[PDB]
Each structure stands twice: as C-alpha cells, then as structure tokens.
Design a protein around this ligand. Structure first.
Ligand SMILES: [Zn+2]
Lengths: 241, 37, 144, 138
C-alpha cells in the first residue's frame, strides 16, 4: 500500500510474486513449520542414476544434466598482514542434453555477488533460478521429462523453483560425474573469463561426432575426457593437444 | 416522525447530533484458416 | 520532604446539573467529531517506550501551550446564561450568590440557568417522568 | 472493398526476406524490419505446411494460433524496440546455414535478456527447431 508512480506497481507485483514463491528465508520458515507440524507430502520418488541404469539416458525422454560446481569460484592471494584470502572470479552453470550434446552455458558474472554475506547459499539458489528460467524459455515439446543434478545440495532449491512444472522429475545420481572439469575446456574457460556482464552461451559439445558414433558412445567419450581433465588437467590437455 | 430539534427524519430528540436549541482479424486469418480464436 | 510520595490533596466537587450539562456537551461534540472526521487515528499503547524514562515536566512539557479541549460551540443567544462559565474547572466558584464560596459546597441557580442546563443535558438526562413506567421493573420487584 | 484491400496486400507481400545489418541498427527501419520479419515467419510456416506430416503435425496448428498476435503486432508496427530488434537479429542469424547456433543464443537474449508474449516467443523457438530439423535433413 502506498504512493505509486508509473511502472512501479507492476514491478512490485512481479517482485513480490517471485519473492513469496522462492526467497530462501521464507523457505527455511516453511520447512520448520512443516517439521514442527510433522506434515509430509506424498510423491513418487524417481530412482537414482547409476552405472547399472545410465543406458536409459539416451532414449526418447528428453533429459538435461545440471552442474553448479563452477557457479561460485575464487582465486587466492596473501594479504599484507600475512593472512591468506580469496577474490571472486567469473563462473558458470553447466546444463547439458546428453543425447544431442547441446550445452547451455549460463555465465555467472562477479557483479552478481554484490559483496553479500553467505554467498555459497546464494549460488545454489541463483543456480535454481537460472535453470528454471531456462526451462521456461523452452516450448513444451522441448522441455525435459527429467533433470539430473550432479550435486544433491541442488535438489531442494531446484525443486522449489520447479514447482511450476508438475510433470518434471528432478533426479539425483550416484555417479560423481566430472562435469566440473568443463572449465578446463579452453574455449569455455576463455568465454567465461572475458565476460563483462551476465549472458548465456550455447554450444554442441559433441562436435558432429553423432554423424559416425552413437549418443551412448559420445557421452562415454565426453565423460572420459572430462574425467582425465579433472584428474590431472595438465597431463590431460597435454594428451588432447 | 422527525427530530423536532433539527427537522430530520428518523432519530429522536435524545439521539440528535446537532446541539439543543430553544476487423483486421479477417485479413490476418485468411492467410491460414477460418475466423475464430 | 524526602520526595518519597506526592498525594493529590483535594476532592473533585461538582454541581450535578452542571456536570451533566458539561458531559452532555462533550457527548454531542464527540458524536459530531466521529461523524465529521474522515479518519480517526487512535493512540498506541503504551504511549512511550519501555526503555525511556518518564519525561521531565519542566524541561519538555511546561513550555508547550496546550491544544484546544473538547468544547461544544455554544450559542451567544440561546445559551447566554451558561456560555460565560460552562467550561471552567470549577464553574461559578467565584460567583458569591450562585455558590457558597471557594470551598465549593453549596449552589443556588435561577430559572434561566436551570432551564439552559436542562436543555443542554438532553442526551444524558433522564426523561421518564411517568412513575408507572417502572411497574415490575424497580428495586423491590427485583428483590422479590 | 475489404477483399480488394486483401488482394493488394498479398500483391505487396510477394515482393524479399533477406535482412540487412544496417537496417537492424536504424530507428527509421521500424516498418521495413516489421514487414520483413512478418514475411520471413510466413515463409517458415509455409515450409512447415509443405512438410506437415513429417514434423510434429499436432503442434503446427497451435503454433499458427500462438503466432497470430505477433504477426498482427508486426503488421501494425506496434512491437517495442527491444523486442523487434532482438527478433530481427534472431531471424538474421536464422537465414544463414551455419548460424543456427547463434539464432537460438540470440533467442535467449529475446526471451530471458505476458501470456500472449510468452506463447509467441516459445513459438519462435519452435520455428528455430523446425528450421534446424529441415536444414539438417536438407
Ligand atoms: Zn436531530
């Protein structure tokens, strides 16, 4: 209630709608009220991804991977007083369709953090906000039936942001897939490094291999390369190049 | 019945508030289909 | 003289037909104000914060001129016998023939004054002159 | 009189879709960009009609319905500048063979940075995917 000028009232409407839907402190309140009241909501829990069932990734249900590991990043230096300290650097969200090789790479710029406290929480919530906006940009036939998150800490923030989409399961995995090593890919590293503002850059990470090999084979190749890059980056690059 | 103190109807003397006193739809549709959204 | 306690050492004596007329004027004024005032802003309670001491009267309060009280506007003609004095703290307390003296214990009015006070008292005065009204609704029937 | 006006309108519509970078960058290009984008989207939808049973036929009808208000808003030059310029650069990328990847990246600029707006925007994404499917098949 109060004195509106032109354009303010629609903005505050949209602002309050999203804030009430998905603010993290109001989520803590709701979860505590649920725990104190001992109320639980029924659902059909989708199974985990593992090495016994991951062949299912390449059937006709559209799927997307999500990795948050590179959303918050830092570099380290030693201060004048003898202490050691961090400084934030540009980051990203890795979102990959494993059948087609389409990578959606949302760049998370250093201006997003605004010097705030408790940034490692804010990163997980920002990740869910960008993933759910990305899903909303796609038409119904191209929206996935399942989304797989590499780190379980994403499951609550993403489920909250995805309540708009009742048909879409969010899945955990037993495989510690190496997708954090995407920032060891030279071109992606450069693209994230040079950015002066938030933007999303789109690629195919399978580089037309699908003309001569299957999606299963292409995923195996991608995971093998990224595993080596995570294992020993210098040696892996020095094999590839 | 009216309030004799002020002349207004309804309320009594004791209940008075005054003090006591002594069609471009068709153009764009015809490229494709029938009218009607 | 130690400052331990202060008693108010006086009795609020009032003249009953005057007190009834004063409160009736107050009643009419408050009714009119509730009607006319578009938004009546009520006070908040407690009026002062728990951690703030009570105000020094001489520093903060004594120098401020008070605001207007609730006084109903009386007619210069049709209230002439009471307009000069109705809102005093002790009405007629200096008028040696209307009141016994400044001890304020006995009063004696004329017919024009008593008529004016009766006329002002219309909200808060009784108007049941008929003694048969209280048939089986009186003290002794309640006792029975 | 209205059918005759329709006749001269379709007579103008057949004469081309190729967009120019300088006209994207120009305020005076508002009518030209609007009309050219309208015609190019009509050409995409026509080639979907030519290939209807091969590629998601149940969705083409709803796509035509959803793209109705965009095409009307273009036809009356009523798009806001940011929407028109972002759509024009999306369609500019879409006209080249190799630049399909950048068209969908520019669609992200369009769509991310009401209900009717959301419908026609996601329908533009549908057009992009039809273009990708066809060009990969041809
Ligand atoms: Zn009245």
């Amino acid at each position: 209630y109060g004195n509106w000028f032109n354009g303010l009232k629609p903005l505050i409407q949209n602002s309050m709608r999203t804030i009430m839907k998905a603010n993290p402190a109001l989520y803590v309140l709701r979860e505590r009220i649920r725990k104190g009241l001992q109320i639980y909501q029924s659902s059909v829990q989708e199974p985990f991804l593992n090495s016994s069932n991951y062949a299912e990734l390449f059937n006709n249900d559209i799927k997307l991977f999500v990795d948050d590991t590179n959303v918050y990043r830092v570099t380290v230096h030693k201060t004048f007083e003898g202490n050691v300290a961090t400084k934030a650097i540009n980051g990203c969200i890795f979102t990959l369709n494993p059948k087609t090789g389409h990578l959606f790479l949302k760049i998370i710029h250093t201006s997003v953090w605004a010097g705030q406290k408790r940034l490692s929480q804010l990163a997980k919530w920002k990740t869910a906000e960008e993933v759910s906006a990305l899903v909303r940009s796609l038409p119904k036939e191209e929206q996935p039936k399942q989304i797989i998150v590499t780190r379980k800490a994403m499951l609550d923030p993403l489920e909250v942001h995805m309540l708009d989409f009742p048909n879409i399961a969010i899945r955990p995995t037993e495989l510690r897939l190496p997708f954090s090593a995407a920032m060891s890919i030279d071109k992606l590293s450069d693209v994230v490094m040079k950015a002066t503002e938030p933007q999303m850059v789109l690629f195919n990470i399978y580089d037309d291999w699908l003309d001569r090999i299957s999606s299963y084979t292409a995923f195996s190749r991608l995971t093998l390369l990224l595993r080596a890059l995570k294992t020993n980056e210098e040696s892996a690059k020095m094999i590839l190049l | 019945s009216f309030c004799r103190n002020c002349g207004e109807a309804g309320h009594k003397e004791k209940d008075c508030m005054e003090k006591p006193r002594k069609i471009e739809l068709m153009k764009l549709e015809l490229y494709k289909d029938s009218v009607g959204s | 003289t130690s400052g331990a306690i202060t008693f108010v050492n006086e009795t609020p004596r009032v003249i009953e037909p005057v007190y009834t007329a004063q409160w009736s004027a107050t009643w009419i004024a408050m009714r009119r104000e509730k009607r006319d005032r578009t938004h009546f802003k009520r006070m908040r309670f407690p009026p002062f914060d728990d951690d703030e001491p009570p105000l020094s009267y001489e520093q903060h309060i004594e120098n401020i001129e008070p605001l207007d009280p609730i006084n109903l506007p009386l007619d210069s003609q049709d209230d002439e016998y009471v307009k000069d004095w109705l809102y005093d703290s002790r009405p007629l307390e200096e008028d040696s023939k209307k009141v016994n003296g400044t001890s304020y214990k006995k009063w004696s009015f004329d017919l024009p004054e008593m008529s004016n006070l009766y006329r002002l008292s219309t909200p808060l005065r009784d108007e049941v002159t008929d003694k048969n009204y209280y048939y089986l609704f009186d003290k002794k029937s309640f006792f029975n | 009189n209205r059918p005759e006006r329709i006749q001269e309108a379709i007579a103008q519509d057949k004469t081309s879709v190729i967009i120019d970078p300088s006209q994207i960058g120009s305020t005076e290009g508002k009518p030209l960009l609007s009309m050219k984008c309208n015609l190019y989207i009509h050409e995409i939808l026509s080639r979907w009609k030519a290939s209807l049973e091969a590629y998601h036929p149940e969705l083409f009808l709803d796509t035509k319905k959803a793209l109705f208000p965009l095409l009307l808003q273009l036809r009356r030059n009523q798009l806001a500048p940011d929407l028109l310029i972002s759509l024009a650069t999306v369609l500019y990328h879409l006209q080249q063979p190799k630049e399909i990847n950048l068209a969908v990246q520019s669609y992200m600029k369009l769509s991310i940075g009401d209900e009717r707006t959301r419908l026609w925007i996601t329908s533009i994404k549908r057009l992009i995917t039809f273009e990708e499917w066809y060009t990969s098949n041809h």
